Amino acid sequence: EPCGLMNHLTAVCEVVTQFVYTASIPALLCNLGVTPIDGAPHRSYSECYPVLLDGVMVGWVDK
């Protein structure tokens, strides 16, 4: 009955438990080509990808 439910991890696999802070990553992304939400990207939308940094909408990257 527990077939397929009780899986077991592989040897190399590991759960991420270290909690860090994501302060400089939005500024780093906007220093790269991430045009943020409020400004307008230099190509039109639908030729731009959403960027989602851990639950927070960040911007619009050109294709």
Partner: protein, 51 residues
């Protein structure tokens, strides 16, 4: 101090840091193949038939 309006801007230059050049090497670096097992040197019959 009136701050009147102006015309429409033609183009918008986007300044951004350049792509990371010379980061990846032109050949690839793979993990080497684990060797096939060798017959070890110095193997001899240690069992003699009794009597």
């Amino acid at each position: 101090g009136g701050l009147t309006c102006a015309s429409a801007p033609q183009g918008t230059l986007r300044i951004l840091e350049g792509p990371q050049q010379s980061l990846s090497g032109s050949p690839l670096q793979p993990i080497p193949a684990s060797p096939p097992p060798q017959i070890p040197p110095g193997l001899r019959p240690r069992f003699c038939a009794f009597g």
